[PDB]
């Protein structure tokens, strides 16, 4: 009997066994359906495609995401994805093993409650549990104090923790995301004559973003350098066979994390949110928090992002103290890494939720036990 | 010194003087060239024909449009048309008067930049200016709030404006056009035995569309009414002298504005685009936008189009609020009407672009001044 | 009970049984009637001749085709031809077996509707079905993707198919034919002193075309080579006993497929139609279509036609991708070959049209079932 660790973020879906260092199933969460007409008879057809197979044939289908902001919008598409993992991609019986699921900090109550019935009633599975995706980043570092920062693709947020005591009046959540950065890029490229408007066209705009984008350390002189010299102007080809030339939009797209006025959302930014989170804390434990800034988002992989946060906070902190941003190189799977430790842990074995507990109270047991 | 107002849409070209209520030159923008062989000697010949003269002799020439989607494709054909307006059709010197030109919202940068050199270097004309064809519809109404909708023949789009403050993160542009409605009609008529395949044959298919087409208020019962009773079946004659009988294709052609799947373009429709434009706005100024829907396209002239938009949005709006679509009867020239007001306006006289400003910076001055 | 497969193109008529590799009846579709006066009494006479017998005695009769462009013009001549196949040429009872008929893509509605009554009311035959002569070319290759091109003698057209899903907004039809190539040849030969003006004279002009004509890989140097050297000048004899010498008109006749201005028809050509058909498709499935160009027309049999299409499209495609034209050697009967497979197919047995279905609805059932 080994437990199962399942992460389901917005976008990629990750899963594996307990007691390991790497997952086994990584694939996007898309549900596609055809839209043209069938003619030839002898072929075998399907009404929908789920895993990586829907990615291979995108010239016909209409793609669709179930999760938008960390909130389950369409439940019938979600049952196809969990059925795809337990049988086809990974091979297991459901009733043999316990599971472990992760969520977001301030989502509403019915999101973490409808998923109790599915893991008990339609899947006869014992011993589930629900965690929070900020505590699980500290187990990958092995520390016991500090402040985290995870963005990924749904939401960005940060939770301060000192000596194993969390501070609930200091959690900050911002709805600026990863897919909003994709959508702003395909608006800027119409200033040279490129136009990508289809759900299928969206994924070859994502693939440009991951290859050649960087966060500049300064902003004003970069607008004057690239306007005079043609030095940073690069090129890229697409599956039609043509050539696309991109310059001056490489660094201009990740600058919305520091000035959210370009979208029109009125907020503060990714650096003043971290500064106001420490300021709402006490006066005696601020010193141990300037030296511990872990940072483990999927969006964090841009080059030049660590040196930018060094320069910004020292303009806000007083002149005596010391700052330090920690960035491990494998900071993409770190939410799955901490899930492997807590499942194989010995003290944890009284924190499961048995099937008899559900028959006594019902689906409202989850607000009492886990937190 | 009176200024000149020149509108150049896809198709018809309109022009006149400032301070007036109606233009003076209305003619299509076609360039034709012959294709057979000349035999008789004593006649006087020309290599090409430009204005309404090319329309009179279409049995020989090959017609050609310069503008396709609101984008200048062929520059050498464009210089013949502007030369035809300033001298032949309207009689004026170029260097005496200032001009005023209009464009589309999201066309690329080089479209509004190559036309700066032509209005300065090859035409010695001072004080040009470039506007946007959605702001100019509100001056014809005299209001100061509301949301517009202009289609015409190139592109359909809509811009929300509140109290003289435009909202740049809410502009929606759709490439469904007027000439695409012509091209779908000449595909449907081959189900009875009619075939029109030539660039010269295209204009007598356009003339059918303007005379007998209507937008039905319902769609499903109309397919059952006209299939049983022969009531709405009419007739039409052509310059050969024969008789054409058309029924069931009268309303079926403008239904692609509500279901664009008939072409194969995958989009939303003309009514969900307007609904999602208000929804991306704020929460406090939605009430002043449901009561102000101006509508001033050239394509809008179908009968029964105003009552159809009343019925559709009330299925999407909440049950308390009030909707109102405004449709003035002279809504065809309204883009030229607003151009006459802003030219004769007193405050406007510091917004021109002098010739000395071009000699200081160059053709990149247009991205700074006008917007 | 074995089904019958009947192909009726413009010109030759082909028929046979299901489950076979070659037809049994191949003969042209001509109806002739005499025009002189009868004198001798003891002979037995007929008012008309139908099959190959009318071809043997062409010195008296006036020949006549029923089908002109793929459209049934004269119905009374068509009933004589179907009566000739079911009884005289092939021997069968009509009421014993089901049939299977083929058509053209964009012919009008009444062409495929009057032929329903004849196969039910005057011929008591159950279970007919109507197909399209582009899908049936892929079954002869056994593939499931690609783009076809069939010309033959009536019309040339092309249909793109991907993974068993057809794309209805990309079908292109051109009315340049095979008999138009015959008619242009007998105009050019009057420049040496040959004159063939009779319906009977037409068939010995067709027989010249099939024996010595070729498609040159270049055009400009061929006009300079044959004007200086007398190398490609050949000879031919006719049933009078005389000698005809033909040079410089061998390659000049099939050049109208690439430049249709020689007739006077204003169109694009056989290679730009194929290029614009791919360009109207998507961006992700263009790569699987440059590698699959099947080509199965009756007119395709000219020597040197495969190497000409290799050279032309590479001037239009981008420089990276790969093109490939497929040409099987038995590409003449391939429309009949695919008809043999689909009749003996097991899944197909729910797609027939029973006689009771006609008694419920009527002749308008054919627009619902088959497509």
């Amino acid at each position: 009997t080994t437990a199962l660790v399942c992460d389901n973020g917005s976008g990629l879906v990750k899963a594996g066994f307990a007691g390991d260092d790497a997952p086994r199933a990584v694939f996007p969460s898309i549900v596609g359906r055809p839209r043209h007409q069938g003619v030839m008879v002898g072929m075998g057809q399907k009404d929908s495609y789920v895993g990586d197979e829907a990615q291979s044939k995108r010239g016909i289908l209409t793609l669709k995401y179930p999760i938008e902001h960390g909130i389950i919008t369409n439940w019938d598409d979600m049952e196809k994805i969990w059925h795809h993992t337990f049988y086809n991609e990974l091979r297991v019986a459901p009733e043999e093993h316990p599971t472990l699921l992760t969520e977001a900090p301030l989502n509403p109550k019915a999101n973490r409650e409808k998923m109790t019935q599915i893991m008990f009633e339609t899947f006869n599975v014992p011993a589930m549990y629900v965690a929070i995706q900020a505590v699980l980043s500290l187990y990958a570092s092995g520390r016991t104090t500090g402040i985290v920062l995870d963005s990924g693709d749904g939401v960005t947020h940060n939770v301060p923790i000192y000596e194993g005591y969390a501070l609930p009046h200091a959690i900050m959540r911002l709805d600026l995301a990863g897919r909003d950065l994709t959508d702003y890029l395909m608006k800027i490229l119409t200033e040279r004559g490129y136009s990508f408007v289809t759900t299928a066209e969206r994924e070859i705009v994502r693939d440009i973003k991951e290859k050649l984008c960087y966060v500049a350390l300064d902003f004003e002189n970069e607008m004057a350098t690239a306007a005079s010299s043609s030095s940073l102007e690069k090129s890229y080809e697409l599956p039609d066979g043509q050539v696309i030339t991109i310059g001056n939009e490489r660094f201009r797209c990740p600058e919305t994390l520091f000035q959210p006025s370009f979208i029109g959302m009125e907020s503060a930014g990714i650096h003043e949110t971290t500064y106001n989170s420490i300021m709402k804390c006490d006066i005696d434990i601020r010193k141990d928090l300037y030296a511990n800034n872990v940072m483990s988002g999927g969006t964090t992989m841009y080059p030049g992002i660590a040196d930018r946060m060094q320069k910004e906070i020292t303009a806000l902190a007083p002149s005596t103290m010391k700052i330090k941003i920690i960035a491990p190189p494998e900071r993409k799977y770190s939410v799955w890494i901490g899930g492997s430790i807590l499942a194989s842990l010995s003290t944890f074995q009284q924190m499961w939720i048995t099937k008899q507990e559900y028959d006594e109270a019902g689906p409202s047991i989850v607000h009492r036990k886990c937190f | 010194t009176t200024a000149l107002v020149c509108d150049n849409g896809s198709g018809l070209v309109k022009a006149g003087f400032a301070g007036d209520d109606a233009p003076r030159a209305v003619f299509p923008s076609i360039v034709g060239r012959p294709r057979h062989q000349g035999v008789m000697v004593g006649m006087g010949q020309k290599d090409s024909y430009v204005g309404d003269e090319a329309q009179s002799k279409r049995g020989i020439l090959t017609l050609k449009y310069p503008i396709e989607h609101g984008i200048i494709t062929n520059w050498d054909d464009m210089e013949k048309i502007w030369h035809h307006t300033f001298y032949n059709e309207l009689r004026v010197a170029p260097e005496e008067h200032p001009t005023l030109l209009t464009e589309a919202p999201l066309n690329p940068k080089a479209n509004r930049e190559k036309m700066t050199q032509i209005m300065f270097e090859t035409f010695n004309v001072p004080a040009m200016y470039v506007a946007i064809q959605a702001v100019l519809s509100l001056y014809a109404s005299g209001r100061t709030t509301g949301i517009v909708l202009d289609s015409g023949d190139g592109v359909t789009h809509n811009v929300p404006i509140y109290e003289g403050y435009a909202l740049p993160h809410a502009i929606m542009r759709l490439d469904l056009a007027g000439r695409d409605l012509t091209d779908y009609l000449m595909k449907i008529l081959t189900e009875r035995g009619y075939s029109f395949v030539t660039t010269a044959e295209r204009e007598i298919v356009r003339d059918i569309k303007e005379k007998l087409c209507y937008v039905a208020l319902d769609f499903e019962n109309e397919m059952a009414t006209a299939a049983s009773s022969s009531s709405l079946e009419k007739s039409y004659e052509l310059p050969d002298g024969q008789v054409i009988t058309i029924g069931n294709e009268r309303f079926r052609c403008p239904e692609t504005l509500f279901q664009p799947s008939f072409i194969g373009m995958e989009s939303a429709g003309i009514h969900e685009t307007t609904y999602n434009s208000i929804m991306k706005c704020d929460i406090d100024i939605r009430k002043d936008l449901y009561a102000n829907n101006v509508m001033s396209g050239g394509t809008t002239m179908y009968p029964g189009i105003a009552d159809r938009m009343q019925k559709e949005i009330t299925a999407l709006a909440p049950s308390t609020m009030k909707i109102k679509i405004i449709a003035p009867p002279e809504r065809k020239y309204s883009v030229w009407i607003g151009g006459s007001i802003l030219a004769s306006l007193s405050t406007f006289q510091q917004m021109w672009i002098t010739k000395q400003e071009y000699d200081e910076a160059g053709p990149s001055i247009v991205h700074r001044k006008c917007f | 009970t074995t089904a019958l497969v009947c192909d009726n193109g413009s010109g030759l008529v082909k028929a046979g049984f299901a489950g076979d590799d070659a037809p049994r009846a191949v003969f042209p579709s001509i109806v002739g009637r005499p025009r002189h006066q009868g004198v001798m009494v003891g002979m037995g006479q007929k008012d008309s001749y139908v099959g190959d017998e009318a071809q043997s005695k062409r010195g008296i009769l006036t020949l006549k085709y029923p089908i002109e462009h793929g459209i049934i013009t004269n119905w009374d001549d068509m009933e004589k031809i179907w009566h000739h196949t079911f009884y005289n040429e092939l021997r069968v009872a009509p009421e014993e077996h089901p049939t299977l008929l083929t058509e053209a893509p964009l012919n009008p509605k009444a062409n495929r509707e009057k032929m329903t009554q004849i196969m039910f009311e005057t011929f008591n035959v159950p279970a007919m079905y109507v197909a399209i002569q582009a899908v049936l070319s892929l079954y002869a290759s056994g593939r499931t993707t690609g783009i076809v091109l069939d010309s033959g003698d009536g019309v040339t057209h092309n249909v793109p198919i991907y993974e068993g899903y057809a794309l209805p907004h990309a079908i292109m039809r051109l009315d340049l034919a095979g008999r138009d190539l015959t008619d242009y040849l007998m105009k050019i030969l009057t420049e040496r002193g040959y004159s063939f003006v009779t319906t009977a004279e037409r068939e010995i002009v067709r027989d010249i075309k099939e024996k010595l004509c070729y498609v040159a890989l270049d055009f400009e140097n061929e006009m300079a080579t044959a004007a200086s050297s007398s190398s490609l000048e050949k000879s031919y004899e006719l049933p009078d006993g005389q000698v005809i010498t033909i040079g410089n008109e061998r390659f000049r006749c099939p050049e109208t497929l690439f430049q249709p201005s020689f007739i006077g028809m204003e169109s694009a050509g056989i290679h730009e139609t194929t290029y614009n058909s791919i360009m109207k498709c998507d961006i992700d499935i263009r790569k699987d279509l440059y590698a699959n160009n099947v080509m199965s027309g009756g007119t395709t049999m000219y020597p040197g036609i495969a190497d000409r299409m290799q050279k032309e499209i590479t001037a239009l495609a981008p420089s990276t991708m790969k093109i490939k034209i497929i040409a099987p050697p038995e590409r003449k009967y391939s429309v009949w070959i695919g008809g043999s497979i689909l009749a003996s197919l097991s899944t197909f047995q729910q797609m027939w049209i029973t006689k009771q279905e006609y008694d419920e609805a009527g002749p308008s059932i054919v627009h619902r079932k088959c497509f």
Partner: peptide
């Protein structure tokens, strides 16, 4: 200039 065909 890419997938349109007037751009």
């Amino acid at each position: 200039x890419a997938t349109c065909p007037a751009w």
